[PDB]
Automatic annotation (TrEMBL), chain A:
Binding site for Mg(2+) 2: 274, 302, 305
Keywords, in A-Z order: Metal-binding, Zinc
Residue ranges of the TM segments: none
UniProt binding sites for Mg(2+) 1: 274, 302
Binding residues for Zn(2+): 274, 302, 305
Protein name (Swiss-Prot/TrEMBL): CRISPR system Cascade subunit CasD
Residue ranges of coiled coil: none
Top-level taxonomic group: Bacteria
Annotated residues for binding of Mg(2+) 3: 274, 305
UniProtKB/TrEMBL annotation, chain B:
Organism, as annotated: Candidatus Cloacimonetes bacterium ADurb.Bin088
The protein's name in its UniProt record: CRISPR-associated protein Cse2 (CRISPR_cse2)
From TrEMBL, chain C:
Superkingdom: Bacteria
Gene that encodes the chain: casC
Organism: Candidatus Cloacimonetes bacterium ADurb.Bin088
Name of protein: CRISPR system Cascade subunit CasC
TrEMBL record, chain D:
UniProt keyword terms in alphabetical order: Metal-binding, Zinc
Highest taxon of the lineage: Bacteria
Full-protein positions shown: 358 to 521 of 535
Annotated protein name in UniProt: CRISPR-associated protein Cse1 (CRISPR_cse1)
Length: 349, 165, 371, 164, 266
């Protein structure tokens, strides 16, 4: 059972599949990817020029059957667009500014199923794995945010089960999902029902050429799917909003229990400030704590000097860095804290 | 949040001498007046050893000093925005309400290190109307995650819900 | 060639700039709320300063007929001047036209000369009037700030077509953001009655708003566009640059200064000579907190020095070295106690800084160019 | 294509001519309205569009028809409302004008029900701006204080007002 | 093969791109409203730069547009956080005293500060076929565009706000299928006291790159990328099994590394 259909994921921050009714400086768009637009995307991915497209490639690929499922409808967003500001414009020339207003779709995603010849689908997918040219979503200022070559080809019978095959991928966990997903699919005669129903509407996106752009109409129908029954909700990948590493804390750990022994050996079991016999070790340079402990930034200390340094660190600021003995600074405050500890701390506690 | 409960219970268990010691240290650091440092270390250190969670040191210090100055019976269901809204509703709606509301809304702009006096004026307004309770556990939990946006959102929403009724 | 000045200035509690509701102006930078002083406020306070008085040769006014009458003496021509001003597409709403007009003060005598004589007709004189306002650009303040003026079209004389009446700005001034978080404060004031009565009440009760902050000021001057704005007057351009430095350093905006008097000097000035403008406002994307071991100004200067080192090491180009001077009074505040290498010259006197800037600019001396 | 002082861009001008055409012998109860629309200013073509509208009948009054026929100036009053004390020489809130076309297009799916007033109404259509205005308020009043939440609450209430 | 440049740039409060009403241009993403800079504004500001023109069939016609189809591709500059527009209330002053303290003019202007994410794409095959087999000039114009795009900004309202900032993170990658990383900032960046706006944006970019490297990009073909911050100001994924192949602390070194990969030219 060789695969017979190809799936396209069309999702980007900004999208614009232009409609037939623009014809002027009001560049509009359609609610779904047009057939001519995705055909031009395919021809750009295969490296076929505009003149070369009109002879064989477009008539060959116009025999496929296409259906688009809506994953996210998006929001239509306009854009004021001036041309030739501070510069002349063609036709002789004129020092003038051209005003226009463009329309894009924002935060939208579509799934396109294109059933056809298995060799055609295989060659098309092979071309789409490494596109010849940069493929955008309608306009050149709309690059895709997801790989078009994402979903694998397969063999199915109807377009409804084809759009049922691919699960719906969820964003962040709180985000809700659409409950009724509209599918817009090409009308199929079947050679028995020769006359289309009255709900079938004409769209004008059957292409012939691209340099003298020519289109013909086609009958398009619109049905719907129910999520869960027809499309299973996929689960998001392992991800999170980036947070700075809050490190960890663990002394029971045997590796630190031996690093402190190495430190007490290497400073010869003596304090750095008052040179009394050492009791513990202060953990200066708290970065790389727990798993990447280097017995260099640690400094052995007695109980009174360690308590004084902890008193100084609890007061004032406190960040990943610490207060390091052997510094010529902070000596006077450490000695004052030593005096206060000696003359004020009560052992009855 | 059991560590916060133990912290608040130990705060209520305090005698009057160390309460006066903490009262004398309002607005101060942690590096001076050694009895305060020793008392705070005795209060806070056993929480980390048994309980994996523990309130932040600055939050715990602020809560201890505020409890020393403004001794309130800890009671569940007496969060600060709700009491503030109940006080604000029984006010003149033209002059006093904007002033007191501005003093309340000043709070949700700073960090933990500068909330002492803007909280002390709030506790003074509370003590003016003879309150007898305050949710120290909920206030500590909210103050811990003060940088999360839904925390401030729920703080303001609870204040508005108590104000409106 | 561009001269860029970055300044750090801590201010006493005051309200130097405020919006329509009286609150001090704020902005959102780096996701955090900072205090702001609008750039036009700084530009006007420098422009209308005492230290810039010898260079003020332009007026931005709405009442030009009043100036015409006040410079014509006693002969009555005020209605006539208003009429000719209306003919060149300016409109008239009770002695003040609908638009502000920027023009050097030296050309009011010429306008008086055209308006006085009845030898010429009306409409042609209007055209002549345009030719004086389109060429009254030889002022230091017009050269610095820049002027654009577009007159009306529904009441023009159809024979008064205008020349080019714009001047590109030779000075870019940023909005003075704060290096730390915003801390707005309310001052509850009362105003008492000097005459006793029955009650103990006072005349008025209100609240004002004030805040104290450390501001980061950024200015940029384009020397080539400056000397083109004054038509090759390099001497006058250098005089403007020196006077502008003195006024910017030694002047503060006069907003509520009779009640706060925050006349604070800058604690650090960095003057760089470049070819492309760079702003060090991203030094304080992380707001400056306070540690007991230092203070606000020293921490701000250290953060600025760290970001300047980052910028110089990450955008070094051997084709365009950058020469900068650091100024602090009597070298009170160096450029951080970590590098001692980002400042090509350390200056402790403001006058020496201005003289060195002028000598780098063109080799002139200050006392030569002051007149 | 400019959205000047007296006009706010909202696209799809179908709402304008359904008063004069639906008042003098242009009614056949059931049918589909084809509604070719070509717009130009002096010797300059601007735009051309079309829209079919399904109708069944259900003759209605003229007050709602006149209000719907004047929807162009109802939206312009919504956008041009600021929060300060300047006079009419102002632009109001420009961020509303960015979300106006999407809400207008989403309402326009039920033009037949809007015109016949059998399942749609002006107050029925005001809910479409309610979800869009929630996201704009988070940007115009971004603080987390009580007052900012209050201004955000008052901002969602901005619904268009029919007036002729 | 395709070259892709991703850029993170915070801007001081300004109005770098306007519309018919003066407001900064915005867009919609992640369920919220973000600030935006239109792609044609960035392309124009890159193209007409005097330092760019004085630096380098024509190289600008080969890279940009005028069937001559450009290999350049500039996407709209979305923002990694919720937009925050603001109004500044300006009052004009009169130097001539009158009967009252009138202004002369009263109004409001708009400004906004944002941390924009920029995406760029250069098609190497179209570039080399545009210049008829030439390669050294192609690498030269690629480097020229890299320096220009790293050191340029739009001129909108820069006489009043002066937002002459510099980028704080650049990521240059080589791969075949074009994918942008705007999906990283689907969740808007919210600041915390332990990080910056730029730091969190760079970290979220690193997280998204790590997740997509663990996913679609299998061992079919390795992906070569270079990460640059000034003087190693910000790391993209500290260690993290070397998510970025290199860490660079000067623009010239990144330009040389990219040139030496693409052709080995210097
Ligand atoms: Zn010791």
């Amino acid at each position: 059972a060789p695969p017979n259909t190809l799936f396209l994921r069309l999702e980007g921050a900004l999208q614009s599949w232009g409609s037939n009714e623009a014809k002027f400086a009001l560049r509009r768009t359609a609610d779904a990817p047009t057939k001519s637009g995705v055909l031009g995307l395919l021809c750009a991915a295969m490296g076929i020029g505009r003149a070369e497209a009109a002879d064989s490639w477009l008539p060959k690929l116009a025999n496929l059957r296409m259906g688009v499922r809506i994953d996210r409808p998006g929001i239509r967003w306009w854009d004021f667009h001036t041309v030739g500001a501070g510069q002349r414009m063609r036709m002789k020339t004129r020092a003038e500014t051209l005003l226009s207003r463009r329309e894009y779709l924002a935060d939208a995603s579509f799934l396109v199923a294109l059933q056809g010849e298995p060799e055609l689908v295989a060659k098309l997918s092979a071309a789409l794995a490494k596109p010849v040219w940069a493929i955008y979503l309608g306009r050149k200022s709309c690059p895709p945010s997801r790989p078009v070559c994402e979903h694998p080809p397969g063999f199915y019978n109807t377009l409804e089960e084809a759009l049922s095959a691919v699960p719906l991928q969820k964003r962040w966990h709180n985000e809700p999902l659409p409950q009724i997903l509209p599918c817009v699919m090409d009308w199929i005669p079947g050679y028995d029902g020769e006359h289309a129903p009255d709900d079938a509407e004409i769209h004008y996106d059957l292409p012939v050429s691209f340099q003298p752009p020519r289109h013909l109409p086609r009958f398009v129908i619109r049905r719907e799917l129910v999520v869960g029954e027809d499309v299973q909700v996929s689960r998001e990948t392992g991800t999170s909003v980036w947070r700075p590493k809050g490190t960890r804390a663990d002394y029971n750990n045997s590796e630190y229990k031996k690093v402190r022994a190495e430190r007490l050996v290497m400073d010869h079991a003596a304090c750095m400030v008052c040179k009394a016999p050492a009791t513990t070790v202060q953990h200066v340079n708290y970065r790389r704590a727990g798993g990447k402990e280097i017995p260099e930034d640690l400094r052995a200390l007695c109980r009174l000097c360690h308590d004084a340094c902890t008193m100084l660190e609890y007061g004032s600021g406190m960040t990943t860095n610490r207060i390091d003995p052997c510094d010529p600074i902070w000596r006077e405050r450490i000695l004052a804290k030593r005096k206060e500890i000696v003359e004020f701390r009560s052992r009855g506690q | 949040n059991r560590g916060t409960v133990d912290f608040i219970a130990s705060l209520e268990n305090l005698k009057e001498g160390d309460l006066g010691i903490l009262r004398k240290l309002r607005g101060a650091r942690l590096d001076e007046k050694l009895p305060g440092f020793d008392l705070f270390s005795a209060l806070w250190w056993p929480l980390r050893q048994k309980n994996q969670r523990a309130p932040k040191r600055e939050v715990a210090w602020l809560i201890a000093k505020l409890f020393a100055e403004f001794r309130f019976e800890q009671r569940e269901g007496a969060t600060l925005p709700i009491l503030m809204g109940g006080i604000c509703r029984k006010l003149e709606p033209k002059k006093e309400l904007p002033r007191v509301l501005a003093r309340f809304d000043q709070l949700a702009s700073l960090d933990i290190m500068q909330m002492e006096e803007p909280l002390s004026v709030i506790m003074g307004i509370l003590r003016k109307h003879q309150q007898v309770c305050l949710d120290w556990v909920g206030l500590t939990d909210v103050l811990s995650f003060w940088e999360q946006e839904p925390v401030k959102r729920e703080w303001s929403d609870s204040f508005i819900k108590a104000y409106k009724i | 060639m561009l001269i860029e000045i970055h300044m750090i200035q801590n201010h006493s509690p005051a309200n130097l700039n405020r919006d329509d509701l009286g609150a001090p102006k704020t902005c959102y930078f780096g996701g955090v709320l900072r205090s702001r002083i609008s750039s036009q406020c700084i530009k006007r306070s420098i422009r209308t300063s005492n230290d810039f008085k010898a260079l003020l040769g332009g007026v931005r006014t709405r009442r030009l007929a009043d100036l015409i009458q006040q410079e014509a003496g006693e002969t009555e021509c005020w209605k006539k001047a208003q009429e000719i001003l209306n003919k060149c597409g300016f409109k008239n709403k009770d002695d003040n036209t609908k638009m502000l007009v920027f023009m050097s003060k030296d050309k009011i005598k010429d306008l008086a000369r055209i308006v006085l004589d009845n030898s010429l007709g009306l409409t042609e004189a209007a055209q002549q009037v345009a030719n004086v306002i389109a060429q009254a650009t030889l002022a230091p303040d017009i050269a610095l700030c820049g002027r654009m003026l577009e007159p009306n079209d529904k009441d023009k004389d159809k024979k008064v077509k205008w020349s080019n009446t714009t001047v590109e700005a030779a000075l870019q001034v940023a909005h003075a953001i704060s290096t730390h978080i915003a801390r707005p404060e309310i001052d509850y004031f009362v105003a008492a009655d000097d005459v006793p009565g029955e009650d103990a009440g006072a005349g008025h009760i209100g609240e004002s708003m004030f805040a104290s902050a450390c501001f980061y000021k950024y200015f940029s001057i384009d020397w080539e566009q400056l000397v083109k704005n004054l038509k090759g007057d390099t001497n006058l351009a250098a005089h403007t640059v020196g006077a502008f430095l003195l006024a910017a350093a030694k002047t503060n905006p006069s907003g509520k200064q009779n009640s706060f008097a925050a006349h604070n000097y800058p604690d650090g000035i960095l003057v760089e000579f470049k070819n492309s403008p760079i702003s060090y406002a991203n030094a304080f994307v992380r707001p400056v907190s306070v540690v007991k071991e230092s203070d606000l100004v020293e921490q701000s200067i250290g953060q600025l020095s760290n970001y300047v080192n980052d910028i110089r090491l990450g955008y070094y180009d051997e084709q365009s070295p950058v020469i900068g001077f650091w100024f602090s009074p009597n070298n009170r505040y160096p450029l951080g106690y970590k590098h001692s290498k980002l400042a090509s010259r350390n200056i402790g006197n403001l006058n020496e800084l201005v003289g060195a800037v002028l000598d780098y600019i063109g080799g002139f001396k200050w006392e030569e160019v002051q007149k | 294509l400019m959205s000047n002082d007296r006009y706010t861009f909202a696209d799809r001008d179908w709402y304008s001519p359904l008063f004069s055409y639906l008042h003098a012998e242009g009614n056949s109860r059931q049918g589909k309205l084809w509604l070719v629309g070509f717009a130009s200013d002096k010797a300059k073509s601007i735009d051309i569009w079309d829209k079919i509208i399904e109708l069944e009948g259900t003759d209605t009054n003229d007050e709602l028809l006149a209000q719907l026929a004047n929807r162009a100036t109802a939206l312009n009053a919504m956008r041009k409302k600021p929060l300060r004390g300047d006079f009419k020489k102002s632009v109001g809130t420009p961020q509303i004008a960015d979300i106006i076309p999407h809400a207008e297009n989403r309402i326009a799916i039920n033009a037949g029900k809007m015109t016949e007033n059998r399942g749609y109404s002006w107050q029925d259509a005001d809910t479409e701006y309610g979800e869009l205005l929630t996201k704009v308020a988070y940007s115009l009043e971004p603080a987390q204080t009580v007052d900012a939440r209050l201004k955000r609450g008052n901002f969602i209430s901005r619904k268009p007002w029919p007036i002729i």
